[PDB]
Design an enzyme around this catalytic site. Sequence first.
Site, mmCIF file in Angstrom:
data_model
loop_
_atom_site.group_PDB
_atom_site.id
_atom_site.type_symbol
_atom_site.label_atom_id
_atom_site.label_comp_id
_atom_site.label_asym_id
_atom_site.label_seq_id
_atom_site.Cartn_x
_atom_site.Cartn_y
_atom_site.Cartn_z
ATOM 1 N N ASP C 59 0.826 -1.196 0.000
ATOM 2 C CA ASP C 59 0.000 0.000 0.000
ATOM 3 C C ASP C 59 0.865 1.252 0.000
ATOM 4 O OD1 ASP C 59 -1.808 2.182 1.005
ATOM 5 O OD2 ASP C 59 -3.228 0.519 1.135
ATOM 6 N N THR C 92 -3.518 5.966 -3.325
ATOM 7 C CA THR C 92 -2.424 6.691 -2.687
ATOM 8 C C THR C 92 -1.167 6.672 -3.549
ATOM 9 O OG1 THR C 92 -1.891 4.695 -1.449
ATOM 10 C CG2 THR C 92 -3.341 6.289 -0.408
ATOM 11 N N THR C 93 -0.795 5.494 -4.056
ATOM 12 C CA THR C 93 0.375 5.400 -4.920
ATOM 13 C C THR C 93 0.185 6.223 -6.184
ATOM 14 O OG1 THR C 93 0.965 3.214 -4.081
ATOM 15 C CG2 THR C 93 1.819 3.839 -6.236
ATOM 16 N N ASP C 393 -9.029 -1.905 1.896
ATOM 17 C CA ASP C 393 -9.048 -1.307 0.564
ATOM 18 C C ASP C 393 -10.194 -1.861 -0.276
ATOM 19 O OD1 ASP C 393 -7.005 0.502 0.868
ATOM 20 O OD2 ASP C 393 -5.462 -0.778 -0.008
HETATM 21 N N1 LIG Z 1 -5.394 -6.867 -13.908
HETATM 22 C C1 LIG Z 1 -4.985 -5.632 -14.277
HETATM 23 N N2 LIG Z 1 -4.537 -5.387 -15.525
HETATM 24 C C2 LIG Z 1 -4.130 -4.164 -15.902
HETATM 25 N N3 LIG Z 1 -4.130 -3.097 -15.089
HETATM 26 C C3 LIG Z 1 -4.555 -3.204 -13.812
HETATM 27 C C4 LIG Z 1 -5.015 -4.506 -13.324
HETATM 28 N N4 LIG Z 1 -5.375 -4.333 -12.042
HETATM 29 C C5 LIG Z 1 -5.161 -3.032 -11.734
HETATM 30 N N5 LIG Z 1 -4.674 -2.364 -12.791
HETATM 31 C C6 LIG Z 1 -4.325 -0.930 -12.817
HETATM 32 O O1 LIG Z 1 -3.252 -0.733 -11.909
HETATM 33 C C7 LIG Z 1 -3.535 0.322 -11.002
HETATM 34 C C8 LIG Z 1 -3.384 -0.219 -9.595
HETATM 35 O O2 LIG Z 1 -3.020 0.850 -8.742
HETATM 36 P P1 LIG Z 1 -2.677 0.562 -7.206
HETATM 37 O O3 LIG Z 1 -1.410 -0.248 -7.144
HETATM 38 O O4 LIG Z 1 -3.932 0.063 -6.545
HETATM 39 O O5 LIG Z 1 -2.379 2.056 -6.714
HETATM 40 P P2 LIG Z 1 -3.187 2.632 -5.461
HETATM 41 O O6 LIG Z 1 -2.929 1.614 -4.385
HETATM 42 O O7 LIG Z 1 -2.557 3.973 -5.215
HETATM 43 O O8 LIG Z 1 -4.604 2.681 -5.966
HETATM 44 C C9 LIG Z 1 -4.951 0.794 -11.248
HETATM 45 O O9 LIG Z 1 -4.919 2.146 -11.698
HETATM 46 C C10 LIG Z 1 -5.496 -0.089 -12.345
HETATM 47 O O10 LIG Z 1 -5.979 0.727 -13.412
#
Ligand SMILES: Nc1ncnc2c1ncn2[C@@H]1O[C@H](COP(=O)(O)OP(=O)(O)O)[C@@H](O)[C@H]1O
Lengths: 533, 49, 527, 105, 106, 76, 526
Positions: C59, C92-93, C393
């Site tokens: 996270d 957040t990221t 989350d």
């Molecule tokens: N299976 C997947 N395939 C492609 N992109 C994805 C998949 N799952 C999530 N994502 C993308 O990756 C990002 C995940 O962000 P994340 O690591 O959750 O950052 P934060 O924790 O700040 O929300 C999202 O913006 C989403 O659009």
Amino acid sequence: ALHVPKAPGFAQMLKEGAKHFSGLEEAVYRNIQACKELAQTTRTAYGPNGMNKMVINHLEKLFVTNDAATILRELEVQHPAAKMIVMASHMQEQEVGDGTNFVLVFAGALLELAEELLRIGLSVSEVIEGYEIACRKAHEILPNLVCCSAKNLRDIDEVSSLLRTSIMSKQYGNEVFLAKLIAQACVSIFPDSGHFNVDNIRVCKILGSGISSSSVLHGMVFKKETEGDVTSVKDAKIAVYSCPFDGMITETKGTVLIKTAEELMNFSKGEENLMDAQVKAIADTGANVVVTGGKVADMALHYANKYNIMLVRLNSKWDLRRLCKTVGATALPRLTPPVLEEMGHCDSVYLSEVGDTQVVVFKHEKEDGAISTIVLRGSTDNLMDDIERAVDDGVNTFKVLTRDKRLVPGGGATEIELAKQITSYGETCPGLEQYAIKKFAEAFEAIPRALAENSGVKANEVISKLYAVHQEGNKNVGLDIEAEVPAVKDMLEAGILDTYLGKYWAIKLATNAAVTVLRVDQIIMAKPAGGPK
Amino acid sequence: ALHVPKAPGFAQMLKEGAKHFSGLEEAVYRNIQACKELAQTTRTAYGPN
Amino acid sequence: MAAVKTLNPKAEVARAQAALAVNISAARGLQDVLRTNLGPKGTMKMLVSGAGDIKLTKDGNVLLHEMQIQHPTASLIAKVATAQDDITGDGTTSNVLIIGELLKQADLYISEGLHPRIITEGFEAAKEKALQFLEEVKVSREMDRETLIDVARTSLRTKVHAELADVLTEAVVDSILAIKKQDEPIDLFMIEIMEMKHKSETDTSLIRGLVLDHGARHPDMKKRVEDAYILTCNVSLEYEKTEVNSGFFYKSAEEREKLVKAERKFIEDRVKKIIELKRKVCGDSDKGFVVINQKGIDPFSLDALSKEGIVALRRAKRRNMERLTLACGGVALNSFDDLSPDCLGHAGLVYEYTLGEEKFTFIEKCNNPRSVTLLIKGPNKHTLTQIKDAVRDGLRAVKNAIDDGCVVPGAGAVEVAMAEALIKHKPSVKGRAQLGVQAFADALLIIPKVLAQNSGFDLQETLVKIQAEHSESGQLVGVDLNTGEPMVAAEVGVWDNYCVKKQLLHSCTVIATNILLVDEIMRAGMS
Amino acid sequence: AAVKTLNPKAEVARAQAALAVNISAARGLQDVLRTNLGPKGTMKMLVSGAGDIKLTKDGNVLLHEMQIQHPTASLIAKVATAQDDITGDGTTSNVLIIGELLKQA
Amino acid sequence: MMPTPVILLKEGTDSSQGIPQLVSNISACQVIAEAVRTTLGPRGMDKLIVDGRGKATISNDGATILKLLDVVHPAAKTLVDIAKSQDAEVGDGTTSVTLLAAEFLK
Amino acid sequence: RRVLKRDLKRIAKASGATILSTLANLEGEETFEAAMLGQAEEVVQERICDDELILIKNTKARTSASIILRGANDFM
Amino acid sequence: RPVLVLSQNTKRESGRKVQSGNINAAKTIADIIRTCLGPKSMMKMLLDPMGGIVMTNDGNAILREIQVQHPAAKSMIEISRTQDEEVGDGTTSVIILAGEMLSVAEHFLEQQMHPTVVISAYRKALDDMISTLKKISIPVDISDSDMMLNIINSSITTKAISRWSSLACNIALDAVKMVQFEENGRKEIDIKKYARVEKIPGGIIEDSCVLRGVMINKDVTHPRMRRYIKNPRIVLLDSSLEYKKGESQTDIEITREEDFTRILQMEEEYIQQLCEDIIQLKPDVVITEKGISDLAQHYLMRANITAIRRVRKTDNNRIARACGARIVSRPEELREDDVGTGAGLLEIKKIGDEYFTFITDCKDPKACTILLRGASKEILSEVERNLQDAMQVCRNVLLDPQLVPGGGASEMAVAHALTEKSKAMTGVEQWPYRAVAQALEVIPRTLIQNCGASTIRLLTSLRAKHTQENCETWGVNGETGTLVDMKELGIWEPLAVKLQTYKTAVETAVLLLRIDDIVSGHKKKG
Ligand SMILES: Nc1ncnc2c1ncn2[C@@H]1O[C@H](COP(=O)(O)OP(=O)(O)O)[C@@H](O)[C@H]1O
Ligand SMILES: Nc1ncnc2c1ncn2[C@@H]1O[C@H](COP(=O)(O)OP(=O)(O)O)[C@@H](O)[C@H]1O
Ligand SMILES: Nc1ncnc2c1ncn2[C@@H]1O[C@H](COP(=O)(O)OP(=O)(O)O)[C@@H](O)[C@H]1O
Ligand SMILES: Nc1ncnc2c1ncn2[C@@H]1O[C@H](COP(=O)(O)OP(=O)(O)O)[C@@H](O)[C@H]1O
Ligand SMILES: [Mg+2]
Ligand SMILES: [Mg+2]
Ligand SMILES: [Mg+2]
Ligand SMILES: [Mg+2]
Ligand SMILES: [Mg+2]
């Protein structure tokens, strides 16, 4: 041109004592090295030929044992990856009771081979996926490796034979006697109801007469003395009170308000008469032993001595509850005489001296009871502690057998069979996960290798012989300890068997720990500062 | 959030005892102030009086 | 040197380009560290505290809190991310990455002599256009179980292992659908999150009831009651001292015994009220009472209750009153003055589980519970903490999706389309603010860049492939983390919360604008 | 790192850290020497430890008279010294072009 | 011994393994035994031990002498423990136990 | 409440009021008579630079005076 | 053993050095915040010694976060605080003006002019400054809401909230208008006590609003109580609803066995009696500044009443003003008039992960809360500061309906008027008069410098323009850096703010010009 400045960005913003390791070489290889080091420290204590280690903790206390979980507990492990592996081992100890050294050794071998795979070119994700697939395959294979079942737990001989292997790794030379003791103690417990309670087995350590003189008592032993003059009852009628053996007082505040001379002259006499009446009312129910969880008043003690009542004062409420369970009494909260249901019964309560310690014994003549105790003798405190650890391992093995009766061959036979079958399966699997599957299979060799190394023979010859024999089709063959030359023998007929559930849980936990360590890519360590506890 | 680090670049590369003044307020006004002080010190001895 | 150092010699000051350099360096460092968190393919970080506690996390907010950083700009960005986590619970990221890229793109022009004010004006114009486009591109849809499952997967897969995410998706979606009242705000306090430390990670599940981390204190009470009435009370059943300093005065032992017996009448009256209610409600041994009490019960009352076959729990949590009244369906009582069978809750099964030195009580098989519990199980403490954060989350994501019927395609598709729309809109902006608009678009483009980089593919080539596909087709194509090819995020099921995207835009733009306009940092409060 | 294990008292910048350090030093030198270029440049005062005063806008003199202890600064100073020794001009442009090349890269 | 950036156990942890440590343990047991050797038999002598407080004690009893010695060697403490055990169970022979154990080891 | 003793004495003297440490007449009873009351033409609570103070304007039976000094800071 | 007429640590400085040091200290304080003036100002980051970050461009906050040693700097800080407290705007202006006047005074002090002459000239100048400012003012119709919004806008164009101008202007105007209150023939506004600003990090700034009521961070004591009441009748309290010990020592003496139970039953009966007295008025909401007993909660829920406990006194006063209730302490003396009818909705709702209580539909509320939603705590703090400035400006305009042209137009007009007046004195103090008159040009000069335009050309053009007859409203455009008529740009300032700024700056110059000795190091001797 004489100093390399800190790189701009996170490196400069790092705190004064904090550390940051990132990448393969800085983090993953270091973690694998630390886990391998921990595995090496604990390796030499594996198997019947395992060697005791004398570990002195920070409190100047001396521990001598070969129980891996105890050794890891008493070692001040600092490296966080080794901390994670130690947590896995402790979880294995809590869930099953045996196999902590197996967990540690398997995790160390898995991490070493993972480092090898990473060096030859594989990615962390591929190694992790391969280990997960191989662990699933091993968990599928293992039920087919069961050789026999317990099929009886009320038999002293059968239970002793089953438990011999568990307490042969610890106390190798004299395990038949300990097996018989623990078998008798466990058969006393474990009624017609299928539930078995580990806490129902108590261990009393009385020093002096060598561990061969230990025995099993159907009851309890307390290292204390009787308050009164009566010191032996042959038809005990224990009445247990959780309240102090004294006239009960108010809870807010009590003051004796005297307004005339007559009240002052009569107060103490009336109080004494009231106490006498209460004690005589207790005694008139036939009770001749009184156990109190609190203090004993002088007047109450005198009147109990007048009516020939044995007084025992239990300091800890845990002991009071255990005595109530083992006698059949209800801990009354007041000084009321006990009804016939709440009155406890026992075959004999007496004061005796073992060695130089005075004990109070609540002895049942029947071969039954809620709680049974083992009186451990010996010539050293550390020796009795180690024997107690072995007893705990045997009791946990009996509990596991109650939960699951399936058994698998020991002495590395199960590990060799698992390795052979997983290697066979991994060859058919294409893709880059075959390397990880084969390494997972090869990691099982660390168990027979450790056994052979501890027994003083060449591990490679033993492993080659085991593969050969399992190749003809004998899957119940492990290494022979009582041989100076590398040799193997059948384990089903030799009775060297370990619980299926223990193997299953140990494999699962070791695989999970290794995978969890591999998943880590960056380490941000704060300043150690203090933290005494 | 308790200290202001040195700005990346020339500020960090400066030696420990060295001083760097740049810009109007940091350099020119300070120089003018020093010259004014020197002239003030010598001023009272001007002339026959 | 400066005015502050002249007045306060022991002061630290950064002025003009120094302030911009300091802030941008801090933002770049934070972004460089948090690059590897983004996406399900991101790397797991390991955090060791001063005491030696081990925490495995991915996270962004958790990592920021456990950073060993004392920078002012880092503190500002951490506060912004903390607010983002507090309200929306995700992004957040992405927040940190977008702030850092905004600052970097702005510096790319400021170092060319351009004033920051023009960049900020371009930023606000681009933010307005981007918000309009996001309103255009959202997918309003009534969300059945399938869409919620997709959203929960899109969050939990990024947080934890794939199989653990698969289990947690069903857990979280079922819990939210269980506690969700029609057209009413979702109360996340009604989902208890309890941790047990014995089974494996995938053994965590959902209990259509409640789980309490304490059990009955009397060994004689029943360990398992099949059919149970539930009495939730906030009445102290232990001894209570009089407020006005009573004290007892007696002249004989008999008087003292009378006073002792008569000093418990007040509590015994309430205990006998409970006993009378139990005997009236159930005259057989088939059913039973479970008395959950927020306040303590002294051993005398425990014994009196156990003699009547009543199991009682003491010192329950305050929220558990509402939780039990919503699950079992009773009425929480602050006094027993007028208690009737109608105020009693019901539960189809109550039993106690023992784990080491801790007792757990299970209250399940309720009729139609409006409050459930998520039992987290694992072999390690850090595993439990990681699963708890992931579950938080996922719960926030599902609740956010329920709150507004719209949902936004993920995998970076929305950012790519927003950047293209901003580039198209750029000529309409008058003046040099087109530079700020371009910087804002390029900053928005960071998400597909980081996703492709974490997946191992080439960054620029993958991004140009995605952009070319989107331009030629007009569809919302994201980054396929397995092959690197363009993929329609809507069809696959990679969904993002619309509120999360809106909050990202607003907060990131505001904080970047405020930072760019800072021209001095002072620390002169000492002495 | 690997080096720090053999020599505990060793300073190492590896991978992107080396690029960041070198480019930051080059940018610092560029930021100092931007103001020298052209006839509209700014005079610089150079006061030594003994109190000697030097007024110059020459690139090489300024480079030798700043108080810098950076490796990349030393390399650029050597390059500028060679430039001055052979051609006698272009030192400021030398530093500017090197810094801008590294920044654009 | 390459210095790992993060060491496994706490700093200052001492570990001795193999044949040399067992030989050292045997030597320590010999040292403990020779402190009570002369107090054996009708021609045995007495030992005088002065504690930190200056309160001296004189004894011919092996268990008493061993207890009054502040033995800290982990392997040597076993001889003191078995002397205490012999005193508890029997009460006589607290010198014979230590002499026999050390002679076995030697 | 918490009126300073000197201020109270000045107010009582100016307005014709009487300080009463207790309500006890010479008959042993507890009473308060209207003759013990001061009078003024107005009592207000004015605002003076983000703070407030009470003004007893135009007391009867004696004229009093007070000065409110407005400056640039505390030292002035 | 030295003689030591004075203490060892006592230091004395006197003469021209003291005056030069004081004037230089004032100049340094001015230079700290010189760049934080005008619409194109840049913000500054202040590091709190406690570890917090203050990011602002308000002059008073910046000067308040700075610790200084020179007593002249302390005087300047106190001047900034005084200007902030008196009117709430013009802090940077007053600091800069004081610095400029002290500089032009040092000019004469360097020559053989006694400081008393300079002080007398400054006081005459201040009188003429006040006269001219009152002369060039214009009236304002406070009924016209558009003009009030324009004035607030002109106040907040130079702050970070200027991006959301109409929203902030409406918030400030509405809050001030419905906190305005008159009673017993006395009129008041009291932005300090009522009109609370509550900031909740998160959300978007566009969601900020001022509620027709109050909002507190509180929840119901017991979950069974209603969290949404349509037209509640609110009753406020101070005393606890729980049994309490008496003031005197009241030990009891129990000799009969039934007295303990009797005493506990009397405690319960007392609680029941208090609750019945409260219920007699048939309310729906009960608010207490102190605790509420659990038995009291049961007795109130029996009557279907929502109860909230442990509310701050300021919040409770705000609630009383908003819903037209009167706080009472003894429930037995509760009257019908004390029951708060007028609140049109009470709702406890969750924001983020926390409960907030809303009383937000009051008809004619005399108190209000401002809910700020934003990116973080520092952004919301800066927004709160800007909104406080807006509310202070609105209150100043409401009290004094006079306006003055902004953008430096007033400074140039007053400077020209004083310069024209100085032509007739023909004395020795005409020179300090003219110097302090032209010192007012530092405001347009600073505006031009911050805008980035050429200072000399623009000031010369502005002076030439002001030499004409009807050009008092010609100032400097803060963005384009061009000379524009301020009746066209629309930037105007309250006359009170300008008057306070001019007075405070001149008086600071007078105070610091008066000192010529400094003695320090002596003990407090308290
Ligand atoms: N299976 C997947 N395939 C492609 N992109 C994805 C998949 N799952 C999530 N994502 C993308 O990756 C990002 C995940 O962000 P994340 O690591 O959750 O950052 P934060 O924790 O700040 O929300 C999202 O913006 C989403 O659009
Ligand atoms: N008599 C024996 N011959 C060969 N192997 C044995 C014998 N007894 C036990 N073992 C092996 O020793 C292993 C147990 O090692 P142990 O020291 O108990 O480690 P852990 O406590 O972690 O299980 C088992 O795998 C078993 O196969
Ligand atoms: N009169 C002029 N007008 C325009 N450009 C000029 C003029 N004189 C010099 N230049 C340019 O300015 C630069 C001066 O560089 P200079 O300060 O000499 O650096 P260096 O000393 O390192 O050569 C040259 O590249 C030249 O092209
Ligand atoms: N749009 C504008 N154009 C030109 N000048 C302006 C404009 N808005 C405000 N000003 C001027 O800027 C000054 C406000 O600066 P500010 O930062 O508010 O200082 P302070 O906080 O001390 O009042 C006022 O004197 C006003 O005349
Ligand atoms: Mg074992
Ligand atoms: Mg996320
Ligand atoms: Mg040249
Ligand atoms: Mg003898
Ligand atoms: Mg202002």
